[PDB]
Amino acid sequence: PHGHMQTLIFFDMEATGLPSSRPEVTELCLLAVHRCALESPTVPPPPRVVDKLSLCVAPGKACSPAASEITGLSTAVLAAHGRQCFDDNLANLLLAFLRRQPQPWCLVAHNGDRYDFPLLQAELAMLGLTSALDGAFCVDSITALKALERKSYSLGSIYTRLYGQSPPDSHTAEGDVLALLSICQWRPQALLRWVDAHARPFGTIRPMYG
Amino acid sequence: PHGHMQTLIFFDMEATGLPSSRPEVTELCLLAVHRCALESPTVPPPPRVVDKLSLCVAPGKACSPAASEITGLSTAVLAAHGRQCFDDNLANLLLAFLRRQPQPWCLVAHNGDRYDFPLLQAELAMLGLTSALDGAFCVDSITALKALERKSYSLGSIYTRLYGQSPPDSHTAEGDVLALLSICQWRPQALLRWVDAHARPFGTIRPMYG
Ligand SMILES: CNc1cc(CN(Cc2cccc(Cl)c2Cl)C(=O)c2cc(F)cc(F)c2)cnc1C(=O)O
Ligand SMILES: CNc1cc(CN(Cc2cccc(Cl)c2Cl)C(=O)c2cc(F)cc(F)c2)cnc1C(=O)O
Ligand SMILES: [Mg+2]
Ligand SMILES: [Mg+2]
């Protein structure tokens, strides 16, 4: 018996590779927007009032050449920049950031069901924090945007169809979240309605592995 | 006997007004850059690998009309977006974010000595966390950039003198930090040298009030 989502947390991660490789997180971005920014609003500017967290993470293994080409990250470069692994302090930081947002929380990620949600659950499981985000909800924006539009349903393809130019910085987690936000601002009332109707408990997401 | 700063945390806050008004924080942005991004690098792009935290904060009082005009924030709007006050959870979040960066840490803020540093110390003092950032260092970028250039020494004026266009989004904490970073990337080796030579313990910054 959940109510209306109060915060939409636009969410994207980079990783060492695709799911079949048992990947690890290399970058994450959370962009928390209060529902009022969508309910009561060429390309729309982001809301003035948002919370943002963008962090790089040292994975415990090498990125694949393909992963490095598309994400612009490598394990060696992350290490040169002194990045720390996905550890208890990181999980605590994520939770403290989420706690600054009104509940209910809904993570919104493009192909989140395939990529971002199961990998986040796997990282948390490795720390023994298997219930840390049980109270959050989640939606996959490709599922939402397909349903609403009813071709390619990549961020870039959607954005270009809606706006005309290409999105900026397609190759970072932050760039992806910002493009997703812009898409979500096209018809924001409808998007928000769909999320409220379809949000799933994060606890129902199985870890990608382990 | 401190060594070389390992992380430069470009830092800007918005507040309810100027120091003589006993102001409170309304927005903060931390952009942590590893020294290697400056030491071993028209307008330079930001480094690929950075950590960023941008948060809005509910102050315990109204912003002045002048503050609202220049920052684009008001107490009522922050409240409509469900923002929380500057509390223990916030202080913990800030520390957890800083702990993901290699030490020594140096906060870098434009007119930081007048604005950002004393107000941060005042907020922490109100929570009884008077030593929380004792291990950090700080530099005021107006002091640095004056010394290095050796007219207006605002962010916009410097940026325009260095690059040609105007900076983007002069009216947000994040916009300010990003412009500051761009300025710092002009002659980054010299900037970094100056910081290492002049960094001050954050503990020597007196609270703005109280
Ligand atoms: C097609 N669109 C996406 C693809 C990915 C998969 N990638 C990037 C990647 C793309 C190609 C080849 C490779 Cl080798 C890699 Cl790594 C990830 O970084 C990624 C992240 C995750 F959170 C868990 C995961 F398994 C992979 C992530 N997000 C989107 C998006 O639309 O936001
Ligand atoms: C002139 N440049 C700046 C001025 C301020 C002062 N302001 C903005 C403001 C400007 C004018 C009139 C008003 Cl009424 C207000 Cl509020 C703050 O928001 C501010 C923040 C602090 F951290 C503590 C403080 F006391 C004020 C902050 N930063 C810069 C900068 O260069 O980054
Ligand atoms: Mg993605
Ligand atoms: Mg400032």
- A158 near A183, Cβ under 8 Å? yes
Q: For residue A175, how many other CB atoms are within 10 A of its CB?
A: 17
CA A167 to chain centre: 17
Residues 6+ apart with CB under 8 A from B197: none
Distance from CA of A121 to the nearest CA of B (A): 21
Q: Which of A9, A185, A1, A28 is nearest to A100 (CA)?
A: A9
SS3 per residue for chain A: CCCCCCEEEEEEEEECCCHHHCCCEEEEEEEEEECHHHHCCCCCCCCCCCEEEEEECCCCCCCCHHHHHHHCCCHHHHHHCCCCCCCHHHHHHHHHHHHCCCCCEEEEECCCCCCHHHHHHHHHHHCCCCCCCCCCEEEEHHHHHHHHHCCCCCHHHHHHHHCCCCCCCCCCHHHHHHHHHHHHCCCHHHHHHHHHHHCEEHHHCCCCCC
Q: For residue B1, how many other CB atoms are within 10 A of its CB?
A: 2
Q: For residue A24, how many other CB atoms are within 10 A of its CB?
A: 22
Q: Which of A46, A58, A15, A8 is nearest to A30 (CA)?
A: A8
What determination technique applies here?
X-ray
CB contact under 8 A, A82 and B55: no
Q: Residue A84's domain spans which residues?
A: 7-204
Task: Decide if A1 is inside a domain.
Answer: no
Handedness of CA A132, A134, A135, A138 (dihedral sign): positive
Residue B11's H or E segment, with its range, is strand B7-15
> Which residues of chain B are within 8 Å of residue A37 when distances are taken between CB atoms?
81
> Environment class of residue A94 by beta-carbon count within 10 Å: exposed (0-12), middle (13-18) or buried (19+)?
buried
Give the pair of three-digit tokens for residue A185: 């601002």
Phi and psi of A29, rounded to 5°?
-140, 130
CB-proximal residues (5 Å) to ion ligand 3: A 12
**A159 annotated as a binding-site residue:** no
Residues 6+ apart with CB under 8 A from A204: none
Q: Closest to B36 (Cβ–Cβ): which among A51, A80, A172?
A: A80
Q: What are A56's strand-pairing partners?
A: A27
CB contact under 8 A, A48 and B89: no
**A116 annotated as a binding-site residue:** no
Residues 6+ apart with CB under 8 A from B164: B42
- B32 near B8, Cβ under 8 Å? yes
CA distance A91 to A202: 15
Phi and psi of A107, rounded to 5°?
-70, 135
Interior angle at CA B64, CA B60 and CA B66, nearest 5 = 145
Is the bond preceding A45 in cis, omega lying within 30 degrees of 0? no
CB contact under 8 A, B73 and A48: yes
Q: Which residues of B177-188 are buried (b: 16+ CB within 10 A; e: fewer)?
A: bbbbbbbbbbbb
Task: Decide if A173 is inside a domain.
Answer: yes
Strand-pair category, B25-34 with B51-56: antiparallel
Known catalytic residue at B171:
yes
Task: Decide if A81 is inside a domain.
Answer: yes
CA distance A160 to A155: 8
Phi and psi of A73, rounded to 5°?
-115, 150
Give the pair of three-digit tokens for residue A143: 């599922």
Q: Closest to A100 (Cβ–Cβ): which among B6, B84, B96?
A: B84
CATH number for the domain harbouring residue B135: 3.30.420.10
Quote the number of domains for chain B.
1
Phi and psi of A20, rounded to 5°?
-65, -5
| Residue showing tokens 């952009």 | B31
Phi and psi of B201, rounded to 5°?
-60, 135
Angle between helices B88-99 and A88-99 (to 10 degrees): 140
For the beta sheet containing B7-15, the strands, ordered from the edge strand earlier in sequence to the opposite edge, are A200-201, A137-140, A105-109, A7-15, A25-34, A51-56, B51-56, B25-34, B7-15, B105-109, B137-140, B200-201
Distance from CA of A165 to the nearest CA of B (A): 19
CA distance B134 to B205: 10
CA distance B190 to B127: 37
Phi and psi of B92, rounded to 5°?
-60, -40
B27 three-class SS: strand
CA distances from B54 to A35, A44, A59, A163 (A): 18, 20, 24, 27
Give the pair of three-digit tokens for residue A8: 């939409």
Q: Which residues of A touch B (CB under 8 A)?
A: 6-7, 34, 36-37, 48-56, 72-73, 77-78, 80-84, 89-90, 92-93, 96-97, 99-102, 172, 174
- Closest ligand 1 atom, residue A14 Cα: 18
Task: Decide if A2 is inside a domain.
Answer: no
Give B61's DSSP letter: S
C-alpha R_g of chain A: 16
Task: Decide if B209 is inside a domain.
Answer: no
CA distance B18 to B99: 30
Handedness of CA A161, A166, A167, A170 (dihedral sign): positive
CA distance A81 to A56: 9
> Which residues of chain A are within 8 Å of residue B37 when distances are taken between CB atoms?
81
Give the pair of three-digit tokens for residue B11: 């830092």
User: With left for phi above 0 and alpha for psi between -120 and 50, is residue A171 left, alpha or beta?
Assistant: alpha
Q: Which of B158, B121, B159, B162 is nearest to B138 (CA)?
A: B121
CA A190 to chain centre: 20
C-alpha R_g of chain B: 16
- Closest ligand 1 atom, residue A15 Cα: 18
